[PDB]
């Protein structure tokens, strides 16, 4: 076990956990939570970054002295990957984008980069690999995002046979694009929904649950070559979910139906932004697509995680979207939404 | 000997004497003082199992414990045996005794041999230094049989020298004429002389009769040979002749046994079978080596496909021949109870924690019991010491040395066996200083004792 | 049923162990003659109470108090333990 | 008489009555605390936390110790009501960040040396 | 007026110590042994109360010695053993007490160095 | 007197160097390891041995009050020089 | 003996002894002992029931007029049955003098608050309650003054560890400051500095 890696302490900030983890995409929504959980137990965390170092400041208080090391890397350069994964025994892949830039498309961030990471980790002696895919990933979906997800998942499996693949569904949290996305369309007067959102089912999952599941899969010997599905305890209709979101935010809910072609056209119009798009055609496709049900796959309860319902965590995300009049309203005042459970 | 371990930043720096007027006075032995560095040399840090190639490889605690538990669940009764080493604490001994009893096994043995004829270990005074160390300064004559007290028990020899100097003590030895640092009357090395003294034909017998407070000390090393029972019977005959002739002076306790193993007296108090002969009579399928690094039992004396489990703190002669290795704590890394050669129970304290994944020995045994399904009734150190009190109450009195005198019953029960003595001269294992430095695993791993042996062999 | 070992924990100077002491010093030897292969561990009790322990197969054991007993009482309970009679 | 003087209460009955007064005040305060501090917990959760904190000292039999406990609880309530405490201080009662320490023998044996 | 509390003294709930460091701690009450390197006895007059040694490990950075128990350096001084026992009981700590070890009175005689017939005569000065 | 580890890491005068399997080398990636190049043992070994015509010599390290406490070295052994316990300078009497 | 030794003042010693005798005579009900140190400081040890009377006397008597309360604090001595020792330092501007009054208490016995006699005591008593846990009866507003909100325990007690029990850090998952069990990258290194040889023969205690 390489004595220098033998766990020591009480699992606190100054303890030794025996984990040396290279976390790709640690400057994202899920990456901050994963790095926070890793640094809580006293793990050596290696953060490869390509952005401005300022955008990594929030990751610095998350570890003890010397326990978080920031190194530059290039997605298309395998030497950078080898540099950042040389001394690690765990590699976690959280690289992903919800839109295509002029330099990286969906098959560059979901197929090429994950495959390169997996191959270099396998040839560098890395013992554990964690790869994040989507729950609704399949090669015949109308969304290029999910097709690239499925192709990259199978390619990562080919390159790293004993890798752990985790497929969450619609992660919600403070810095998410699920609850914030629906709360932010109040500025357009109405809420456009395809078929009024009455034929879509969503099973969102809490961000802390996903981070805990990743951490537990890191230290689970039996989870070497398995595939996990991370879903929440409740399935909602899209209409009911958005109505509950607007009720928690205390905003007037004025939904209207929009045909698929018109909504796709507005997504294409918003795609022209040189900055982060407000919405895209792929985002429209993924929002109005029902969540797959894969009961044969292991879930959070098989890693010891009890999935947290949206009702106990929606206020911590949606209280920012309230006005001053409703800013102090409590949690149990909003009458939890109707659930399509079985 | 009462000692002080001085540590700094979780590392043992040195060993110093701690003053105990009745045991070590103000002094310690060179082995006590300078063998501590052997605790940093060949250490078991992680659990190990055998892989597909037959080589020892590192393993988590869970898998090694599950393997041992699965092998233990298969066999039962006589097929499971355990041998205790020389540096095993009372808590670990009682835990192993309970664990093997739940399987209905009684083959709990020690490498050191003590005769079981007559009383055997049934009466405590049969295997104790009844006079005690402080009592040496009251005797007017002492007879030493088949021992080298200078190297077997250096502080006992220092006490004898002190009484020889100040109280004009008269000393006689039966055995090899070793240098004891004081002049003594050497009677020879033939064991038959013992019988002559009992007979009264010998000149020395009169000398014991005139003495007000005679003492007879028999080394446990002489009991390791084939005729140990006969030697013990002859020594008991001599002591009984003294007691019958001179009468009872009071609570003087003429008869003594000098031990050299720190774990022997506690094991005998707990009911461990002395010697290994029980295992050689009925070879087991599963063998527990609780720090047994003496080499008494090898894989030639065992059936093939024998599951050997070694639990210790050092990689020595007993570890490479095992299938599962469980790293344990050393005497500086646990609060453990050891019983004196005079019967005095004492307890160590934790100075540093065990290195790596090493754990306390009784905790290892209790975890293994829980994994295997026969959970032991104790979870903490206080509960396991309550169990120790349940088995032998003297193991919780931590400075008491008083005990009963059952010499009459043991002497009567030793007469029913008439085993013949051997015409082989008594030779102690330690004959010169060079043999003193390396006796157990810690001192054999010590680099300072290697220097001492090299300096003694070639002075340069 | 199968007895494995017995323990007599007697306190050295308390009056309540006196009879037990008498046993050890009168008729223990004969008993050891009769059972030359049964461990009969004689151990020294504290100031509390004398008692006898009996261990059977698979680790099951039970204890009986011997307080203020006599030599006859202690040999009676010992022979009850030895035989298949309670 | 053991030569001991009281703080407020002379027997267990008066101490129990003071305990009940403090418990009533805390139970009444909980919803106001949830509203003012903007906590993401329910009123039931806070009241259960108050009940747990009160039951943590249920084994006390000395009226003086119960008196001092009631005095400390009164200071805690006065800190909470006047908004001298912050959300961090109030939420320290719940230990959301601390990883739960296992209590059975095997887990303690696997992780380390602490009993 | 007095109220006559007849209970055992227990200030455990008032000290603010976490319950882990009250129930699982074992304290040692003892007179420290003389440092064998010096003959001074001034450090063997008072009673000390200390806690059981816990785990110390090596810092991944700089290799320092890290601890996780707050009572690692807590040593208390008492004039009598009974005071230490009372303090431990009222604080709820389980204790182990070691009796004082005092050197025995010695019989020294300078003239014994030059005995006419005894073994105590020295060979050099 | 720096030497190179088999992994390519510089070895300090204390002899420390991380092994091949040690993850702690990752702290030196994209950065450097600080090793002092002047080895005191090698530097003090270059000093010539001082010949004196007395059995006992005195050493204060030079500079008077700017050195170390003054000590006296015996030079009666002919098979070995006298070494200062502070400075490391070597002294001996004329032999041969 | 002149250069390096602090000189003596017998006149002040005599005056302080006379006034200590005076105070002991006037208040036999509460005064248990009077001392004058070798550097001319007057100390009065009193029963805990005499805090309000004695201080009031010392503030209002024409011959005392100790109008100023310089300092009030506590001392923790675990070996004593009454663990805590309450010390009042008073200054008299009229007579240019300083006096010290000492009493005792334990963890459960309240001490009467001296806010009525001296306003300055108001915070000092609070501090004592914060640092040692000594309760003061009839205090206008008795609460923590120095420690953090919700702090458990009293740090100035001898059995309180130097680094405490909890430490603070910012957590991004909950977006706030949290308290966790204390963990140290470098443990505080305890030093055994006491010499095994006696220093001051004048303070030697009987060997029992
Ligand atoms: C959390 O992330 C997100 C953002 O980031 C902060 C966004 O801006 C964002 C888009 C929302 C923006 C803040 C734009 C809001 C401002 C208006 C909607 C612009 C359009 C309003 C009109 C032009 C007003 C003019 C009057 C008419 C009659 C003409 C979304 C959806 C989002 O989700
Ligand atoms: N959020 C959700 O709803 C769920 C997320 N998905 C998957 O979970 C993973 C992480 O999710 P999330 O945190 O929300 O995604 P984010 O958009 O919030 O962060 C993506 C991370 O990947 C990095 N990254 C993106 N593109 C590149 C690139 N071309 N080269 C190098 N690094 C890049 C980003 O670095 P930088 O800041 O420099 O751009 C960033 O650190 C992703 O792989 C996503 O696909 C799984 C189900 C849904
Ligand atoms: Zn010099």
- Please state the domain extents for chain A: 1-342
G75 dihedral zone (left: phi>0; alpha: psi -120 to 50; beta): beta
Quickly name the fold that domain E19-113 has: Double Stranded RNA Binding Domain (3.30.160)
Residue with CA closest to ligand 1 atom 8: A278
Among all ligands shown, which has an atom nearest to the Cα of A24?
A: 2
d(CA A39, CA D39): 26
Say if strands B324-327 and B48-50 run parallel, antiparallel, or are unpaired: antiparallel
Quick one: B232 exposed, middle or buried, by C-beta within 10 A (0-12, 13-18, 19+)? buried
Min Cα distance E91 → chain G (Å) is 9
B354, closest residue in chain E (CA to CA) = E55
Decide if B435 contacts B260 (C-beta within 8 A): no
d(CA G54, CA G58): 6
Quickly name the fold that domain F40-92 has: HSP40/DNAj peptide-binding domain (2.60.260)
Say if strands G97-105 and G42-46 run parallel, antiparallel, or are unpaired: parallel
Structure tokens belonging to residue B174: 């039966």
Task: Look at chain E and count its residues.
Answer: 125
d(CA C82, CA C54): 9
3-state secondary structure of G6: coil
Decide if D23 contacts D74 (C-beta within 8 A): no
Structure tokens belonging to residue D38: 């903007």
Best of A58, A75, A95 to mutate for ligand 2, by most ligand atoms within 8 A of CB? A95
Decide if A63 contacts A26 (C-beta within 8 A): no
Check if A278 has its Cβ closer than 6 Å to any atom of ligand 1.
Answer: yes
Structure tokens belonging to residue B115: 């005769």
Sign of CA dihedral E87, E88, E89, E92: positive
Hey, are the CB atoms on D109 and B381 less than 8 Å from each other?
A: no
d(CA B287, CA B72): 10
Residue with CA closest to ligand 1 atom 18: A187
Resolution of the experimental model, in Å, one decimal:
2.6
Check if A187 has its Cβ closer than 6 Å to any atom of ligand 1.
Answer: yes
Who's near F17: CB < 8 A, 6+ residues apart?
F5, F7, F9, F10, F11
d(CA F92, CA F75): 6
Hey, are the CB atoms on E76 and G159 less than 8 Å from each other?
A: yes
Phi/psi of residue G200, each to 5°? -120, 100
A61, closest residue in chain G (CA to CA) = G170
Who's near B235: CB < 8 A, 6+ residues apart?
B145, B194, B216, B218, B255
Residue ranges of alpha helices (H) inside chain A are 29-40, 78-85, 106-107, 113-123, 144-159, 179-184, 207-218, 238-248, 260-270, 281-287, 315-318
Check if A95 has its Cβ closer than 6 Å to any atom of ligand 2.
Answer: yes
Give residue B459's Cα distance to chain centre. Answer: 32
3-state secondary structure of G99: strand
F26, closest residue in chain A (CA to CA) = A87
d(CA A101, CA A98): 10
Min Cα distance D80 → chain B (Å) is 41
Quick one: B85 exposed, middle or buried, by C-beta within 10 A (0-12, 13-18, 19+)? buried
Cα–Cα distance list, B329 to B268, B312, B354 (Å): 22, 7, 5
d(CA B119, CA B110): 18
d(CA B440, CA F16): 32
Check if A168 has its Cβ closer than 6 Å to any atom of ligand 2.
Answer: yes
Decide if B150 contacts B178 (C-beta within 8 A): yes
Hey, are the CB atoms on F23 and A71 less than 8 Å from each other?
A: no
Chain A partners of G181 at a C-beta cutoff of 8 Å? 10, 12
Residue with CA closest to ligand 2 atom 1: A171
Who's near G181: CB < 8 A, 6+ residues apart?
A10, A12, D98, E18, E68, G165, G166, G167
Neighbouring subunits of B (3+ Cβ pairs under 8 A):
A, C, D, E
Task: Look at chain F and count its residues.
Answer: 96
Neighbouring subunits of D (3+ Cβ pairs under 8 A):
A, B, E, G
**CA R_g for chain E:** 23
Sign of CA dihedral B146, B152, B157, B159: negative
- Across the interface, of G172, G180, G183, the residue whose CB is closest to A36 is G172
**CA A109 to ligand 2 center in whole angstroms:** 9
Who's near B8: CB < 8 A, 6+ residues apart?
none
d(CA B388, CA B269): 10
d(CA B47, CA A268): 60
Nearest atom in ligand 1 to the alpha carbon of residue A279 is 31
Phi/psi of residue B308, each to 5°? -100, 130
Check if A290 has its Cβ closer than 6 Å to any atom of ligand 1.
Answer: no
Residue with CA closest to ligand 1 atom 25: A188
Helix (H) or strand (E) holding E41: none
Phi/psi of residue E96, each to 5°? -130, 125
Hey, are the CB atoms on B356 and A221 less than 8 Å from each other?
A: no
d(CA B460, CA F45): 26
Hey, are the CB atoms on F27 and A69 less than 8 Å from each other?
A: yes
Residue ranges of alpha helices (H) inside D1-115 are 12-37, 43-55, 63-81, 87-91, 105-111
Best of A26, A30, A202 to mutate for ligand 2, by most ligand atoms within 8 A of CB? A30
Helix (H) or strand (E) holding E45: none
d(CA B157, CA B141): 14
Min Cα distance B353 → chain D (Å) is 8
Structure tokens belonging to residue G164: 């405490």
**CA F69 to ligand 3 center in whole angstroms:** 8
Q: In what order do the strands lie in the sheet with B56-58?
A: B56-58, B48-50, B324-327, B307-312, B286-290, B80-84, B107-110
d(CA G18, CA G15): 5
Chain E partners of D72 at a C-beta cutoff of 8 Å? 14
Min Cα distance C85 → chain B (Å) is 22
Task: Tell me which DSSP letter residue A110 carries.
Answer: I
Hey, are the CB atoms on D42 and A319 less than 8 Å from each other?
A: no
Say if strands A20-24 and A44-49 run parallel, antiparallel, or are unpaired: parallel
Binding positions of A are: 25, 27, 29-30, 50, 95-97, 145, 149
Helix (H) or strand (E) holding B270: helix B264-270
d(CA B450, CA B452): 5
Is F87 within any annotated ligand binding site? Answer: yes
Cα–Cα distance list, D82 to A111, D76, D77, E72 (Å): 57, 10, 9, 38
Min Cα distance E6 → chain D (Å) is 7
Check if A50 has its Cβ closer than 6 Å to any atom of ligand 2.
Answer: yes
Neighbouring subunits of E (3+ Cβ pairs under 8 A):
A, B, D, G
3-state secondary structure of G73: strand
Q: In what order do the strands lie in the sheet with F50-51?
A: F50-51, F90-92, F82-83
Residue with CA closest to ligand 2 atom 39: A51
Cα–Cα distance list, A116 to A49, A71, A285, B5, C41 (Å): 16, 18, 28, 54, 71
Q: Does C39 touch chain B (CB under 8 A)?
A: yes
DSSP string, G38-66: TTS-EEEEE-GGGHHHHHHHHHHSTTT--
A47, closest residue in chain F (CA to CA) = F26
Sign of CA dihedral D32, D35, D40, D44: positive
Cα–Cα distance list, B308 to B291, B296, B368, F70 (Å): 12, 14, 15, 63
Quick one: A238 exposed, middle or buried, by C-beta within 10 A (0-12, 13-18, 19+)? buried
Phi/psi of residue B405, each to 5°? -105, 105
Structure tokens belonging to residue G38: 């070798």
Q: How many CB atoms lie within 10 A of CB G129?
A: 22
Is F13 within any annotated ligand binding site? Answer: no
Cα–Cα distance list, B282 to B77, B117, B287, C36, F61 (Å): 11, 19, 12, 19, 74
């Amino acid at each position: 076990l390489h004595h220098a890696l033998i766990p020591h302490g009480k699992g606190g900030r100054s303890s030794v956990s025996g984990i040396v983890a290279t976390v790709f995409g640690a400057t994202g929504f899920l990456g901050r939570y994963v790095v926070n959980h890793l640094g809580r137990m006293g793990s050596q965390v290696i953060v490869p970054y390509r952005c401005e170092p300022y955008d990594t400041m929030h990751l610095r208080p998350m570890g003890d002295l010397g326990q978080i090391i920031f190194m530059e890397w290039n997605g298309k350069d395998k030497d950078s990957i080898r540099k950042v994964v040389e001394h690690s025994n765990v590699v976690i892949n959280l690289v992903g984008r919800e839109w295509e830039t002029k330099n990286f498309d969906f098959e560059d961030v979901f197929v090429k980069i994950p495959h390169a990471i997996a191959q270099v980790s396998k040839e560098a002696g890395v013992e554990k690999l964690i790869h994040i895919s989507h729950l609704n990933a399949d090669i015949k979906s109308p969304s290029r995002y999910l097709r690239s997800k499925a192709v990259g998942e199978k390619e990562v499996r080919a390159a790293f046979p004993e890798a752990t693949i985790i497929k969450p569904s619609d992660i919600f949290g403070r810095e998410d694009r699920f609850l914030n996305y629906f709360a932010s369309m109040r500025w357009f007067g109405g809420v456009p929904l395809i078929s009024l959102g009455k034929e879509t089912v969503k099973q969102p999952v809490y961000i802390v649950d996903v981070s805990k599941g990743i951490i537990n899969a890191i230290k689970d010997p039996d989870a070497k070559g398995k595939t996990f599905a991370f879903v929440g305890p409740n399935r909602y209709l899209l209409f009911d979910l958005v109505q509950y979101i607007f009720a928690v935010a205390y905003r007037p809910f004025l939904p209207y139906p929009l045909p698929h072609f018109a909504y796709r056209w507005v997504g294409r119009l918003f795609e022209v932004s040189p900055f982060e798009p407000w919405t895209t055609r792929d985002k429209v496709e993924r929002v109005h697509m029902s969540d797959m049900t894969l009961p044969h796959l292991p879930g959070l309860e098989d890693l010891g995680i009890q999935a947290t319902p949206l009702e106990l965590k929606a206020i911590e995300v949606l209280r920012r979207h309230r006005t001053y009049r409703w800013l102090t309203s409590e949690m149990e005042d909003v009458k939890p939404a109707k659930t399509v459970n079985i | 000997s009462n000692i002080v371990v001085s540590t700094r930043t979780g590392e043992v720096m040195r060993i110093l004497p701690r003053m105990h007027e009745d045991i070590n006075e103000e002094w310690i032995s060179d082995k006590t003082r300078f063998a501590y560095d052997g605790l940093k040399r060949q250490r078991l840090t992680q659990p190990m199992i055998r892989n597909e190639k037959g080589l020892l490889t590192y393993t988590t605690w869970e898998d090694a414990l599950s393997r041992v538990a699965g092998m233990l669940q298969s066999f039962q009764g006589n097929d499971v045996a355990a041998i205790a080493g020389g540096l095993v604490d009372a808590e670990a001994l009682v835990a192993l005794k309970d664990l093997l009893n739940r399987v209905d096994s009684d083959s709990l043995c020690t490498e050191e041999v003590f005769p079981t004829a007559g009383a055997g270990t049934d009466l405590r005074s049969n295997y104790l230094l009844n006079t005690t160390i402080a009592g040496v300064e009251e005797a007017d004559v002492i007879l030493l049989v088949g021992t080298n007290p200078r190297f077997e028990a250096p502080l006992f020899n220092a006490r004898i020298r002190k009484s020889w100097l100040h109280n004009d003590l008269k000393v006689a030895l039966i055995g090899s004429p070793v240098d004891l640092t004081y002049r003594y009357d050497h009677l020879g090395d033939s064991p038959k002389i013992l019988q002559d003294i009992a007979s009264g034909n010998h000149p020395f017998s009169q000398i014991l009769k005139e003495a007000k407070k005679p003492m007879v000390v028999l080394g446990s090393s002489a009991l390791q040979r084939s005729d140990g029972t006969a030697i013990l019977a002859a020594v008991s005959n001599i002591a009984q002749n003294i007691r019958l002739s001179s009468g009872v002076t009071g609570d003087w306790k003429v008869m003594n046994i000098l031990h050299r193993i720190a774990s022997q007296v506690a094991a005998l108090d707990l009911g461990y079978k002395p010697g290994v002969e029980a295992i050689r009579k009925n070879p087991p399928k599963v063998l527990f080596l609780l720090g047994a690094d003496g080499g008494c039992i090898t894989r030639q004396d065992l059936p093939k496909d024998c599951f050997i489990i070694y639990q210790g703190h050092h990689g020595d002669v007993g570890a490479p021949m095992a299938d599962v290795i469980l790293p344990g704590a050393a005497y500086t890394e646990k609060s453990a109870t050891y019983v004196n050669t005079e019967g005095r129970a004492q307890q160590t304290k934790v100075a540093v924690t065990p290195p790596g994944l090493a754990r306390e020995d009784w905790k290892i045994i209790r975890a293994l019991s829980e994994i295997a399904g026969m959970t032991l009734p104790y979870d903490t150190l206080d509960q396991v010491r309550s169990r120790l009190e349940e088995v032998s109450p003297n193991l919780v009195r931590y400075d008491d040395v008083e005990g009963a005198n059952y010499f009459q019953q043991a002497n009567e029960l030793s007469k029913l066996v008439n085993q013949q003595l051997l015409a082989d001269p008594l030779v102690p294992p330690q004959l010169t200083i060079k043999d003193f430095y390396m006796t157990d695993s810690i001192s054999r791993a010590s680099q300072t004792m290697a220097k001492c042996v090299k300096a003694v062999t070639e002075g340069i | 049923l199968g007895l494995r070992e017995i323990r007599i924990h007697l306190c050295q100077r308390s009056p309540g162990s006196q009879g037990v002491r008498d046993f050890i010093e009168k008729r223990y030897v004969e008993l050891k003659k009769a059972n030359p292969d049964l461990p009969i561990l004689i151990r020294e009790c504290s100031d509390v109470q004398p008692k006898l322990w009996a261990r059977y197969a698979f680790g099951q054991e039970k204890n009986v108090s011997l307080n203020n007993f006599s030599a006859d009482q202690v040999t009676r309970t010992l022979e009850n333990v030895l035989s298949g009679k309670a | 008489g053991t030569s001991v003087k009281p703080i407020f209460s002379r027997d267990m009955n008066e101490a129990k009555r003071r305990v009940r007064e403090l418990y009533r005040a805390w139970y009444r305060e909980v919803p106001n605390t949830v509203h003012l501090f903007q906590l993401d917990i329910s009123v039931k959760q806070g009241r259960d936390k108050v009940r747990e904190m009160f039951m943590k000292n249920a084994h006390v039999t000395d009226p003086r110790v119960v008196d001092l406990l009631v005095i400390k609880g009164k200071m805690e309530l006065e800190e909470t009501i006047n908004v001298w405490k912050q959300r961090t201080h109030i939420m320290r009662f719940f230990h959301e960040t601390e990883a739960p320490r296992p209590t059975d023998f095997l887990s303690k044996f696997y992780v380390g040396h602490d009993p | 007026q007095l109220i006559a509390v007849d209970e055992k003294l227990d200030i455990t709930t008032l000290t603010g110590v976490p319950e882990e460091h009250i129930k699982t701690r074992k304290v040692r009450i003892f007179v420290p042994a003389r440092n064998n390197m010096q003959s001074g006895v001034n450090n063997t007059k008072k009673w000390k109360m200390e806690f059981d040694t816990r785990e110390r490990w090596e810092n991944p950075l700089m290799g320092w010695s890290s601890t996780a128990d707050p009572l690692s350096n807590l040593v208390l001084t008492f004039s009598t053993k009974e005071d230490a026992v009372a303090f431990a009981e009222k604080n709820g700590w389980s204790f182990d007490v070691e009796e004082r070890k005092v050197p025995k009175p010695k019989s020294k005689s300078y003239g014994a160095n030059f005995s006419w017939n005894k073994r105590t005569r020295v060979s050099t000065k | 007197g720096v030497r190179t580890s088999p992994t390519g890491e510089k070895v300090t005068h204390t002899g420390q160097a991380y092994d091949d399997g040690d993850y702690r080398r990752v702290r030196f990636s994209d950065r450097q390891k600080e090793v002092n190049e002047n080895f005191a043992i090698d530097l003090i070994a270059e000093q010539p041995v001082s010949e004196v015509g007395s059995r006992v010599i005195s050493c204060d390290g030079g500079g008077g009050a700017l050195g170390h406490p003054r000590v006296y070295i015996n030079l009666d052994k002919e098979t070995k020089t006298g070494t200062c316990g502070y400075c490391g300078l070597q002294f001996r009497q004329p032999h041969h | 003996t002149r250069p390096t030794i602090r000189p003596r003042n017998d006149v002040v010693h005599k005056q302080l002894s006379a006034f200590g005798q005076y105070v002991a005579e006037i208040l036999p009900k509460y005064v248990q002992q009077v001392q004058v140190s070798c550097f001319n400081e007057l100390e009065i040890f009193i029963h805990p029931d005499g805090v309000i009377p004695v201080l009031t006397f010392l503030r209002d008597h024409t011959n005392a007029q100790f109008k100023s309360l310089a300092d009030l604090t506590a001392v923790d001595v675990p070996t004593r049955q009454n663990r805590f020792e309450i010390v009042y330092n008073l200054l008299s501007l009229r007579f240019n003098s300083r006096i010290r009054v000492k009493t005792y208490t334990d963890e459960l016995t309240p001490i009467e608050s001296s806010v009525t006699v001296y306003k300055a005591a108001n915070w000092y008593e609070r501090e004592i309650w914060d640092m040692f846990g000594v309760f003061f009866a009839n205090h206008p507003d008795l609460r923590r003054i120095l420690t953090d909100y919700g702090f458990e325990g009293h740090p100035f007690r001898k059995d309180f560890p130097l680094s405490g029990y909890v430490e603070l850090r910012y957590d991004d998952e909950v977006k706030r400051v949290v308290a966790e069990p204390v963990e140290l990258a470098q443990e505080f290194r305890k030093f055994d500095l006491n010499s095994p040889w006696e220093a001051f023969p004048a303070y030697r205690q009987p060997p029992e």
